[PDB]
Design an enzyme around this catalytic site. Structure first.
Site, PDB file in Angstrom:
ATOM      1  CB  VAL A  27     -23.906 -15.767  20.690  1.00  0.00           C
ATOM      2  CG1 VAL A  27     -22.823 -16.670  20.096  1.00  0.00           C
ATOM      3  CG2 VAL A  27     -24.671 -15.097  19.569  1.00  0.00           C
ATOM      4  N   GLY A  28     -24.025 -17.339  23.801  1.00  0.00           N
ATOM      5  CA  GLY A  28     -23.163 -18.162  24.630  1.00  0.00           C
ATOM      6  C   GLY A  28     -23.038 -17.703  26.067  1.00  0.00           C
ATOM      7  CB  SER A  29     -23.909 -18.339  29.094  1.00  0.00           C
ATOM      8  OG  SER A  29     -23.755 -17.785  30.392  1.00  0.00           O
ATOM      9  N   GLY A  30     -18.387 -14.679  31.627  1.00  0.00           N
ATOM     10  CA  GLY A  30     -19.553 -13.874  31.281  1.00  0.00           C
ATOM     11  C   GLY A  30     -20.305 -14.315  30.026  1.00  0.00           C
ATOM     12  CB  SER A  31     -23.780 -14.062  29.004  1.00  0.00           C
ATOM     13  OG  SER A  31     -24.209 -12.840  29.585  1.00  0.00           O
ATOM     14  CE  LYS A  47     -15.784 -12.784  28.491  1.00  0.00           C
ATOM     15  NZ  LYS A  47     -14.312 -13.061  28.419  1.00  0.00           N
ATOM     16  CG  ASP A 157      -9.140 -14.111  24.773  1.00  0.00           C
ATOM     17  OD1 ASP A 157     -10.061 -14.420  23.958  1.00  0.00           O
ATOM     18  OD2 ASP A 157      -9.359 -13.174  25.600  1.00  0.00           O
TER      19      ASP A 157
END
Ligand code: BOG
Ligand code: BOG
Length: 326
Positions: A27-29, A30-31, A47, A157
């Protein structure tokens, strides 16, 4: 006992996680991978920290993030559902995985006033809690505010500076927690108007837009400015008066406008606090003083320490082992 893990290959990395966590998709990139936590029936984000102990600074950052997430226990603040490592021992300890709620959207045609009230109320409720821990967010903005379908909001965060307090852009230091209330004002303004309040092209342009709304610093504020070069520049500016906000936020609930006037003050000492804001009449339908909890004291004494990689790593391991799920 310890869970059974399985190994996989995605995000160009190997992911070894407990089997409760199924159907991982990047879902996104840690990864980060989305997953389904079969134990609780929850959709979660997992994560895998990248390079968590590569250096002293990475190791201290890893510790910092884990101590923070472990402390945050509030409905409107992201919390930690799980933390794990495939390591059986400290000598094997190289990877860290963090599990949180998977949120569908962030805050990034107009919202109704009832809805703007509810979103800002939840921000302020979360912020009261964070501030009570003597934590300052410093980068509140729509991409750091997650919402689900129910309009239920959590502060995250996690380049945009449009929500930054002016004192941060002037490199003041000594920040007050009310830096975050400036950011809430900017967010609230945009929810009301559908446009960025202070869409500057650089920081000077942004400061110029801010001063046009709130006016140039008055004598009372000037008394608190120690920077001789800052004072000198400021007094060279053409005197601009504070705009009447009702003539800027046309058609908004008068109570909203009133609250915005109390948040968007240049002098950070005169800005409304989160706890005060929750009692403002704009929130009358949501406000419950016996349900706006505060945080246990948060020990940030580690921030003053200079330790070795292995020391930060062991401290982190201790925190993984001692984790108790919510
Ligand atoms: C608090 C310190 C702020 C320093 C910013 C100083 C210069 C930014 O001011 C810029 O400079 C020119 C005048 O100098 C003008 O063309 C513009 O009004 C302005 O964009
Ligand atoms: C021209 C733009 C000037 C911006 C003026 C910002 C004044 C911010 O407000 C200030 O912030 C400090 C840090 O919390 C405090 O120490 C002060 O008492 C307070 O006046």
């Amino acid at each position: 006992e310890r869970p059974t893990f399985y190994r996989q290959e995605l995000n160009k990395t190997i992911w070894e996680v407990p089997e409760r966590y199924q159907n991982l998709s990047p879902v996104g990139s840690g990864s980060v991978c989305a997953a389904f936590d079969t134990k609780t029936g929850l959709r979660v984000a997992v994560k895998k920290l990248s390079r968590p102990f590569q250096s002293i600074i990475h190791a201290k950052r890893t510790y910092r993030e884990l101590r923070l997430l472990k402390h945050m226990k509030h409905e409107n603040v992201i919390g930690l559902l799980d933390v794990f490592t495939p390591a059986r021992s400290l000598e094997e300890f190289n990877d860290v995985y963090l599990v949180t709620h998977l949120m569908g959207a962030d805050l990034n045609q107009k919202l109704t006033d009832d809805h703007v009230q509810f979103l800002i109320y939840q921000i302020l409720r979360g912020l009261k809690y964070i501030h009570s821990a003597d934590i300052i967010h410093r980068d509140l903005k729509p991409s750091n505010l997650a919402v689900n379908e129910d309009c239920e909001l959590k502060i995250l965060d996690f380049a945009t500076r449009w929500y930054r307090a002016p004192e941060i852009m002037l490199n003041w230091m000594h920040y007050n927690q009310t830096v975050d209330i400036w950011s809430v004002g900017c967010i609230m303004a945009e929810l009301l108007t559908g446009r960025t309040l202070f869409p500057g092209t650089d920081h000077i342009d942004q400061l110029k837009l801010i001063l046009r709304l709130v006016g140039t610093p008055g004598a009372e504020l000037l008394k608190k400015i120690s920077s001789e070069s800052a004072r000198n520049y400021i007094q060279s500016l053409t005197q601009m008066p504070k705009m009447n906000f009702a003539n800027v936020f046309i058609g908004a609930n008068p109570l909203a406008v009133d609250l915005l006037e109390k948040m968007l003050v240049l002098d950070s000492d005169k800005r409304i606090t989160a706890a005060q804001a929750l009692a403002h009449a704009y929130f009358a339908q949501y406000h419950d003083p016996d349900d706006e909890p505060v945080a246990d004291p948060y020990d940030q004494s580690f921030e003053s320490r200079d330790l070795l990689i292995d020391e930060w790593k062991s401290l982190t391991y201790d925190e993984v082992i001692s984790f108790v799920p919510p």
